[model samples]
Structures are given as C-alpha cells and as structure tokens.
Target: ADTTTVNGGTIHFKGEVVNAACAVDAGSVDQTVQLGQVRTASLKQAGATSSAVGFNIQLNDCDTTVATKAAVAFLGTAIDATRTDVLALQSSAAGSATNVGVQILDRTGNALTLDGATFSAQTTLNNGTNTIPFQARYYAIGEATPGAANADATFKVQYQ
Candidate 1:
C-alpha cells in the first residue's frame, strides 16, 4: 500500500490493527499506575484500665518522596483498637490492672507511642501481617504488685 502524508492535520486509520497479532508466540505489553497507602505501626504500651494510645501518624508521600504525615482523611481512637474497649489480644504483662495497653508494632517489632489521640511520633511502618486474627490487643498498665487486688490487668480485645 502506498501512503501519502497529510500536513497540519491528523491521520485517520480505518480497520485499524492494534498490534493485532500475537508477538513472539507469547509476548505482552503492560503499562500501569499504582497508588499506595499511608502505612505505619506503633505501640501503646500497657496502660491504666480504659486508657488508650495511638499509632504513629507519619506517612510516606510516594510521589513527593517526602517523610511527612499523610493527608488521608481518616480517624483513629485515642489508642489502638487492641484493648478491652476493642477486643483482640489480652495483655501478657504482669501488672495490677485489667489488661495491658496496646503494643504498637514496627517492622522490627518495636513499640513506638504510648497513649495518644494526636500525631506526635512520626514513623515509617504499618500493621503488617503479625496482628492476631479474630482478636484485638487489649491491656491495662498499672503500677502495682502482681497477684494483688486489681493488680493483675484484665485483658480484652476491642474493635473499631
């Protein structure tokens, strides 16, 4: 077929062939765009009964590559949901309380925050695949001798 050029305009194709035929028997061209989440993990060490701490709020702005809090529109409880108020895992820490507070987790399994409803600690991590299932982490951290009245923290797991 002899093709001529059309200047200052566009080219029209009829019965177009969109790479119509298979290439190399089994070849493909894939182009895509992906968005990530604002993820991180922190710990709310054992706390007083009914007390709560929050995870870190630091976020990784992928496109910006800047270390800052996420602009995501989300909400959080004063503490982690793993509590008597929530329901997941009970505290194993020996203390004079119901349950121990939450243990916000980092990739390296380290505690971060204590108890909060604000963005104070900035970190880079998220609740990875370690959180207990069908259960939340709960606890009550207190300053008391073990086996004492109200000294042993009662554990319970709460939900969102």
Candidate 2:
C-alpha cells in the first residue's frame, strides 16, 4: 500500500516506408532562413508583415513514376493559442521581441499553416532535381515590440 502508482500513457509512433521519393539536398536540411534585420516600424500594425525572405527545399534524384507530385508541410509551435500559421519565437520574453511571429509562405506568398495539417502548393516532381520555393517573414499579430525575433520551423515532404 506504500508503493506509489504512476499513471502511464501511450505514444503512437507513425511513419511510412516509401519505395520512391526524392532525396532531400544537404543544403535544405538544417538550414536557417534569416529574416534579417527588420525595423519595428515596418511591422507597426496587426496583420502587417515584413518583407519575405526566400528559401528553397531542394529535392534530387526524384522518381516521378512513383510520385508525380509533392508538397511541404511546415511544423512548429504556434505563436499563441489562436494562430497555427505563425511560428513562435524560440527565445525567452526578455530575449525576444513581442507581438511578432514567423510566417511561412508558399511561392505565391500565401501563408502556410505550421500545424502540419496544411501543406504548401503541390509541385510536380521531376526525375531530376526540383526546388520547392518558400518564404519566411515576420508577421505582426499586434503592435510590434522591438527585440530579437528569431524563430525556427521544420518541414515534411508529402508525396502524391
């Protein structure tokens, strides 16, 4: 009766083994997309966004016969309880800016949801190299506060 009982939960592991898919290029993995130095004045109002910095996720040696199309889903913590498309800053309150979050945009400049449930526009896979163009920018969810605004996100490639 003196023994302590600990409740337990289950962790479901999920993944897929694909026979054909493009190899992610080295540069695309573990890469940082810098938003650069942005003036707080540039993001003064709610919904205001800074200039988008372009980045690419390169895929090589793709087999179009198995997968003719591909898309990307960004995964990250939401900036707050309300927004799943904005990536939260990775720094503490004292070290990070306020009211701003990183937004991932597809090639057409539409915001990509970071919840992993949504994916970027599908890009037709070629037998050779293919580049998925994306952009990152600081999005103002409210009045901007000046400080470090760095955030990070990861992407998963989906084949179809």
Candidate 3:
C-alpha cells in the first residue's frame, strides 16, 4: 500500500537586509522644535531668512564594529514647490498669511539645503554615539502674517 501525492507551486518574495541602525535618543525621536510666535513686522525682507531656532538629532548605541562615520540627511518638501531649500509650513485655515516658509540651518546657523537633496560626510560618530546639531528659522518669503509655523522634517542616517 504505497500511494503518494505531491502538489507544489512557486512562491516569490522580496525584502531588504541591512545593518543595524543606531538608536535615536529618546528626546530626538519625533522631536518638535518650536519656532515661537513672532510679529510680521519683525521678519526680515523677502528672500531673507531669520529666527535661528536650534535643535539636535542624537543617535547612540551604534554598531561601531560595522561603521566609523555617520551622516544625517534631512528629507522634506519645500514651502514652495519650486524651491529646493525652504521647508513648507503646515497650513492654517484661520490665518491670512502668504509667502511664509521655514529653513533648516546647520550648527552655525547656516541654511542646510534639504529639498529632495542628498548629503554625506556630515559628522563623526564616537564610541557608539553621535550628535547632529541644526537650526530652524522662519523665512520671510514676503510680507508675513499671523499664522501657524509647522514644518515636518525627517532624517536618515548613513554610515561609512
């Protein structure tokens, strides 16, 4: 009494395998940097950016055995779809403002180009930790108005 039935089909799947990513410091993950309220008369002229708000992105407990250097790239859309440096502010239905934008600055309060742009060689990781400092400001695209300042930016870490 020997009877056997074999039914088989092909299965396809896809995925990506990568090294462990460094742990983001509790305070830095989903962190919100406040740009505080300011008067429209205080903002700089159009094409000029002001208000250097500071923030930090901390990454720790890295796999030093696999990486030595690390850099962070901030990704987001610009306030104006045509621009590649200004960050788009969250819209507010109760405000009557126009040409308002936000800019992300470096440690020294310099704008860090982040419009679908790529970056590398940012900062060096020590032991198993790293800190990336940056600033944010309210850019005066034109005459400002009383409105909400919401800029959402996300970052990715690259290792060498």
Best by lDDT: 2
- Residues 29-146, candidate 2, lDDT per residue (tens digit)? 7677656666777777888887677888888889888799988887788888787788777752764578878788898778988777698898988898999998877778887776
Best by TM-score: 2
TM-score per prediction, in order, is 0.21, 0.85, 0.75
Q: Identify the superior model by TM-score, candidate 1 or candidate 2.
A: 2
Q: 11 in model 1: Cα distance from truth in Å?
A: 60
Which ten residues in a row are the worst by lDDT in model 1? 5-14
Clashes of 3: 1
Task: Report lDDT per candidate.
Answer: 0.22, 0.72, 0.60
Ranking by TM-score: 2, 3, 1
Give per-residue lDDT, candidate 2, residue 120: 89
Global lDDT for candidate 1? 0.22
User: For residues 50-150, could you state the per-residue lDDT of candidate 1 as single tens digits?
Assistant: 22222222211122222222111111222344432322222323421222323333333333332322221222223321122111133334331222111
When sorted by lDDT, best at the front, the candidate numbers are: 2, 3, 1
Q: What 10-residue stretch in candidate 2 is worst by lDDT?
A: 4-13
For model 2, the superposed segments whose C-alpha errors exceed 4 Å read 1-19
For candidate 1, report its TM-score: 0.21
Give all candidate RMSDs, comma-separated: 26.1, 11.4, 17.7
Off by over 4 Å in 3: 1-21
